[PDB]
Symmetry: C4
Subunit: 229 residues, 4 copies
Amino acid sequence: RDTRETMAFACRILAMTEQEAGLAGQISVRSGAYWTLRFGLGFDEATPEDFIEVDRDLNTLSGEGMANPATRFHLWVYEARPDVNSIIHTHSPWATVLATARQPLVISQMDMTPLHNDCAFLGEWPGVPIADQEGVIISKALGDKRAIILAHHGYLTAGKSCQEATYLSVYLERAARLQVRAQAAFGPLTPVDDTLAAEAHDYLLKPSIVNATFDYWSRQTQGIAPLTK
Amino acid sequence: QRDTRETMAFACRILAMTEQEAGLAGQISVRSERPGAYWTLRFGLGFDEATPEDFIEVDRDLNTLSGEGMANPATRFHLWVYEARPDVNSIIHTHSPWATVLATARQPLVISQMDMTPLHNDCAFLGEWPGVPIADQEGVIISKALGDKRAIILAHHGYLTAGKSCQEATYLSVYLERAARLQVRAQAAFGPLTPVDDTLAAEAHDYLLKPSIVNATFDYWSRQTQGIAPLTKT
Amino acid sequence: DTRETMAFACRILAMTEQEAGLAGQISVRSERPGAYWTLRFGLGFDEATPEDFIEVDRDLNTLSGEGMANPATRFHLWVYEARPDVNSIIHTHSPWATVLATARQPLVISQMDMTPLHNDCAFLGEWPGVPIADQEGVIISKALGDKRAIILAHHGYLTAGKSCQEATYLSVYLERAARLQVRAQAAFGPLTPVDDTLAAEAHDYLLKPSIVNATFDYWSRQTQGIAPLT
Amino acid sequence: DTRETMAFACRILAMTEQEALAGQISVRSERPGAYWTLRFGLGFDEATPEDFIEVDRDLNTLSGEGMANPATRFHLWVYEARPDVNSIIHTHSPWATVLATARQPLVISQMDMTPLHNDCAFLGEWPGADQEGVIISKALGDKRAIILAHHGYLTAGKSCQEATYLSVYLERAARLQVRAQAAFGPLTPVDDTLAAEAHDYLLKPSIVNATFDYWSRQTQGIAPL
Ligand code: NI
Ligand code: NI
Ligand code: NI
Ligand code: NI
């Protein structure tokens, strides 16, 4: 119940922080099974009852609905990364600009540091590959990283929890927006010092900050009343 | 008739939601079951306010055959596209923000990302801007330049999409506008883009244009326009 | 009817994203000589109601309505005196038109919707700081000449219409034209202008009273809220 | 009244699009060595008057319910260095952070940028509370604002209304500069004498307070016609 509620909030947060590209969004949580948003729904309409548990053959083991067959590749990532418990893939507007231009992230600001030495870049675009080819390609290119920019496609985040995968997704999208806006006006950016970036990376990825931020974004999706007159 | 008008009303709300307003420049039509006629949004209304009763059926002379209202005379040229393209049943024309950047800069789309592929080998580019021609000349110019494509970027003007259904014309419109936004933002920061392989782009084009995906995506966007309740508070 | 039209013009300007603190100005020439209708000081365009528009004279005395005029609108009298054809003036520091003003870049007519400003947008290259009405009015009236709009370097823009509907339509079209030009030049460099003869025909077509008034009425309905489809 | 003013300042910052839990706001307390601030874990968009607490130099809550955001402790060094400052805002707002990330100072080229003319410091070093406070107080000097390289910005006002006004004007000035440079390259600055006159005009209390009250009314919702 807690997992489905967390996944529903993660979906609403991703929709609120403007990540939508038709029905291209995917989310999963490790259960050889995984929890995922049922087929045909967007992140903005997800409720706890829309998350189903499914095996390697995409058979539903718990809940009502069918899995989005495009999430089958997530099993290869979970198999390669025992530390990963949640995966998010979207074609969000600004991260997809970096993907389309074949441009890796350049760590030049405090909030970009959760991706410092933690964002892989897959240069090859295999088109619409089958689940197995995509899983092997993405697991290999991801390596031990928390995120990957997929050239000509979008991005994927891989977190130890659904809260961490969501936090990485939002921070990667905002980091991409900052980099694209800054390079359009001023050209290539000078990165910050690697040692200080690694310290800021560890600071921003502490569970207390990740969970408090996820809970804040969750409250924002529910609506906040203006101050009374 | 009722289902056609309801589909057109949702298409208008979806275009408005996906931010495509430039005054009353927006046009939408659906080929009528009656020869020589088309359904279209009545004059004076924006896409964001369209309801089923705002779609009227008009003839080649712009006489209203069915419904209450007068046609936007600027939609008369659509008849030439329908005549040239028996496969086309719905047309959308707008001056949306990002697609109009490409049109203004005389820059064709460069297919460099998965969601740009429904326009791969499917977007014509009219390089000449003819000013404000009368519907007949506008119709011949646009039908000839469109050829067999699903979309066209009209230099110094905007774009047009031509679908087998109103759902397909809307899907092409949204994907073209988002593809143009991605390209403009990418080129402003990084310069010209590297196009993806043509064969893989054509496969992704065919995958994304399957009727099941087009209709499910149109229905999803239709639900979005109606408002989605937030998750409840405890 | 004048106060209602001005209230809708204000809501339209706020909706179409022109906001910059309380820097906005709007006026309509009064039927009474030497007077003009304007939004009262301290209110933004987004909160304007018909009762917030007052009629004021050259000395900023309130002739009709409740409230005090924004003294920064005094120079509008100089434009009305120089242009008998002008009945409504709008000045704001809208986001995109102000990028052109800040960069000292005139509009380049390269798309259909930019044509209402073709041969109709002056450019004041000098920024006089915070001048008094006497100086600002002469500077702006002289630079505007017979045009419908002017980009004011390092400041913003002003539109001058035969009606409040036309001043509003010019304001929205200028802001969107500036957005299109800035976005296009950032990605692709300087633009190719369209043919002058065709641009003048498109200018006349888009400035016809029927399309100006239908568009103003459409934007008016949008500010009031539209219910989603059931 | 202080907590209500801070609640409106928070809603205005959220409305004028500044969100990155990175946001900080404080007001110097009437009690020496203390400051009022938004409690930990809340964003500016949800702040109510009861969410502002009074805290001491050791981050102990003196008044109200809640714990302070420990990252606000450095505000004490700015208050100690600047007796004229009574409110401080720090955010990583979208456009001001573009300038900070690119190490680009503001170039005063338009009327609404003038409240920052000769009033915006630039800290070039990114150090990754005692060290942060000394570094930021020294770099800020006597200015109303500072762009912090690779980080964000801070404003320091004589009132919460002035800190909020400086925040909004700096973010909009950064947006204007970034959009203009992307399309047209480096900007020509306006005349310094005229910029200083416009700076003084726009920072008059009547304009600052009327503008803050206008933005406060906007956060509450305005009925359509
Ligand atoms: Ni994908
Ligand atoms: Ni058109
Ligand atoms: Ni002004
Ligand atoms: Ni910070």
